[PDB]
Amino acid sequence: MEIYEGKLTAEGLRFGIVASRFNHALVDRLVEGAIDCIVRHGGREEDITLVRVPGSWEIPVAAGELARKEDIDAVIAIGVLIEGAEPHFDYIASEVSKGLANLSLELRKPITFGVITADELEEAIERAGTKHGNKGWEAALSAIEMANLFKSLRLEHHHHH
Amino acid sequence: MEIYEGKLTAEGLRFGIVASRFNHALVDRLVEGAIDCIVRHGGREEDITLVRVPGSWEIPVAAGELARKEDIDAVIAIGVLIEGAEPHFDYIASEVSKGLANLSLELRKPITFGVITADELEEAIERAGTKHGNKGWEAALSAIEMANLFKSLRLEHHHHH
Amino acid sequence: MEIYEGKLTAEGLRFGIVASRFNHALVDRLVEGAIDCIVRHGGREEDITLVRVPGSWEIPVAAGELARKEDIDAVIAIGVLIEGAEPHFDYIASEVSKGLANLSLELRKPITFGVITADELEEAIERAGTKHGNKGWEAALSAIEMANLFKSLRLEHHHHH
Amino acid sequence: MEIYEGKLTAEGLRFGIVASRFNHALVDRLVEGAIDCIVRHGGREEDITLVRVPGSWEIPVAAGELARKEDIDAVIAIGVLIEGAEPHFDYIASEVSKGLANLSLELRKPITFGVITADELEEAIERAGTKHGNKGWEAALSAIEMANLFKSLRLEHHHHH
Amino acid sequence: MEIYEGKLTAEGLRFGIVASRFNHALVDRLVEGAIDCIVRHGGREEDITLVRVPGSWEIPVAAGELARKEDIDAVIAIGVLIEGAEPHFDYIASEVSKGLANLSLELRKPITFGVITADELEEAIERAGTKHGNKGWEAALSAIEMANLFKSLRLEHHHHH
Numbered sequence A, B, C, D, E: 001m002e003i004y005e006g007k008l009t010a011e012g013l014r015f016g017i018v019a020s021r022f023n024h025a026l027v028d029r030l031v032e033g034a035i036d037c038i039v040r041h042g043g044r045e046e047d048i049t050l051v052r053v054p055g056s057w058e059i060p061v062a063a064g065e066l067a068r069k070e071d072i073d074a075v076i077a078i079g080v081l082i083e084g085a086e087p088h089f090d091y092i093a094s095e096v097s098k099g100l101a102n103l104s105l106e107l108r109k110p111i112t113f114g115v116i117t118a119d120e121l122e123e124a125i126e127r128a129g130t131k132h133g134n135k136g137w138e139a140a141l142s143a144i145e146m147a148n149l150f151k152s153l154r155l156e157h158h159h160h161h
Helices: A024-040 A056-067 A086-107 A121-127 A135-160 B024-040 B056-068 B086-107 B121-129 B135-159 C024-040 C056-066 C086-107 C121-128 C135-159 D024-040 D059-066 D086-107 D121-128 D135-159 E024-040 E059-068 E086-107 E121-129 E135-159
Strands: A002-004 A015-020 A048-053 A074-081 A111-117 B002-004 B015-020 B049-053 B074-081 B111-117 C015-020 C048-053 C074-081 C115-117 D015-020 D048-053 D074-081 D111-117 E002-004 E015-020 E048-053 E074-081 E115-117
Touching (some): A002 A135, A015 A024, A015 A056, A024 A048, A024 A074, A024 A121, A024 A135, A048 A056, A056 A074, A056 A086, A086 B056, A111 B056, A111 B086, A135 B049, A135 B056, B015 B056, B015 B135, B024 B121, B024 B135, B049 B056, B056 B086, B056 B111, B074 B086, B086 B111, B086 C056, B111 C056, B111 C086, B135 C048, B135 C056, C024 C048, C024 C074, C024 C121, C056 C086, C074 C086, C074 C135, D015 D059, D015 D135, D024 D111, D024 D121, D024 D135, D059 D074, D059 D086, D059 E086, D059 E135, D074 D086, D086 E086, D086 E115, D111 D135, E002 E135, E015 E024, E024 E048, E024 E074, E024 E121, E048 E059, E059 E074, E074 E086, E074 E135
Parallel strands (some): A002 B049, A015 A048, A015 A074, A074 A111, B002 C048, B015 B049, C015 C048, C074 C115, D015 D048
8 A cells, every 4th residue: 555644844845824914913823823833843934935915805816826936835824704794704704715725726736724713802812812722833734744745746756757 | 228337346446545634533444444345345455545634624635636646546535524613614514525526527537525524423433333334435335336437438438439 | 580499309319317326216216207208209218328326426427427428419417315414415416516517518518407306205206206297307308408409509500610 | 363354256156045935025126136236246147046935944945955066155045034924933033043054054155144034014115115225135245255255264275285 | 047946746756744643633634735735736646655643742753764765855744733731832843843944954855844833723723714724735835846946956966967
């Protein structure tokens, strides 16, 4: 049997990070957790690419560009939605998830979903700020594993060629 | 009438297995279910491909890779989804079913949906211990039928060309 | 004005039938209704193509290959969803609906939807009587009509060229 | 560790079927189940042997002779018991279960038990028409595994020699 | 497919009959029933062997003798049990059915169960006068078909040799 999986070492890897500004209190907290887990899991931070955009809606369009760089191996989606805006929450939420998924299948490059949807500010300030459930921590880690995963997929992809 | 279908021999076939890690006490019995059902329906296991991925989300981006190799006849999607988060489960749920469905139409290769959604860890305990219903068994078998069917369709689509 | 349309004669035409097995009692009921209207309204039964798969999920990936041979003109989707499985109902019906739709767009060849979603056994009985409500009867009628329709269009696409 | 188990390929195997005529409305549905599961599992139906006997009582005595042919690998008992007569049900069920047991011990050749004791005709309509719990289907499957098993026990029975 | 089954001609055959005398008013009817169904289904009756024993218990020991003769092809059990007492009925009933069962599996020669257990002499008066249910007739019939079955099976058991 052939087994593919990614270890968690952040060695030799270049990451993308896409960051909103809306609710900057908790998002800024999230990116913190992302950078940290990157560097401590063995990676260098000069390859972190952080792109900022105003709100949740624009997250997709930006990442689509970051991935068509040759030297960003994986990309970290980062944003927050909290049911403050009721007509937009429906359409911004389902569509961003949807657009991110389509981006990855297309480009064949892992994009990970680091978006808190917290139904209130009380559920938001307790996760990102109090509990180690630093959502950016984990989406960051999952992407690391994906990076080494396509390193497994594509390193064998050249040995066969 | 021209009747097609799949008999159930797994002779000479090569399979894809994508595996999540989350709630590994359950996933792993499912994976076992796929591997066993294969080899006990005639197949050999060095041509099974085993990939491990973090959670339900990354299933498509990875499985799409397994279908762009030539030497895979059908890919078996294996993940579990249990109501942990109201924000995460809904969106990622309809998204995996989507991404899987679309890849299958596209790459012209079967992808099966061996994903538990057991409304509790306990309704996953009833599916593996109370009755034969080990979903990895059943969706993997469906996959065998699809591979022999597509072999039926493409062997006759080799005689008329 | 140029009026395009399809008569209801089934001569010169070659058909597709994609047939599940789940809830066979109801599905046999419908496939009989399908081959019935076909050979009655002017066809032979020798160039009907009848493909069988386990459940509703595979309906797409199967029909997708059937309409990709040269000789299959219109395809008659045939399957049953009754609210037994709770995740397979919502997602496996949303994506087969959407899925078969996008196939017919792409291939430019009529695929009809003869999948009942009858919420109980008693709508499964008032359709399963000979009281015409055999959804395969009507759906197979529509694709016959669409069959000679794309004859009218594709043949008129030959006189213009 | 030496693991002995049978895969499910029905390749090259020759089978025994013993089928009563009593209550044949459902028994016939069984034999259908058996022949199918065999051939769909890679077998060819020329090597199926179908024996007919009046009631339940004769099932053992005949089967015993079938397995004393050299060219029969496994034998599928098929019959129906429904509480008709007091002497019939009690004594014939106890002695069939004991009889078929002893025969397999002595002959050193598997005999599986596809006799339903459905305590009503309606518990056999719920064994057959509302589930795919086709008793002969699975009793046949177990027999396939048994044949491959004694294939395993008897192939290693000739390499040690 | 090969179907072995018994036609019903009693030509060329030789039979064993073992008869208790107890409750002779009715046994006599049964014995006559057997002789009839032999002679009228073509049998000649000088090759019928009729043995009489006292009560129910001694049935098996006697049949063992008749089946060890080379020239008897099938043996008919004939005896009557009526709940004259609970001490004898439970154990002697289980033992004859048992002893008979082992006699046939062993000697490989069909033995029929022509024992009425009628819960009163009035279930035996209803068995004999209300409907043709002449149990000796019926089990004698089954013995004919079994004789011709083993004729079929053993005939092919010499053409292969």
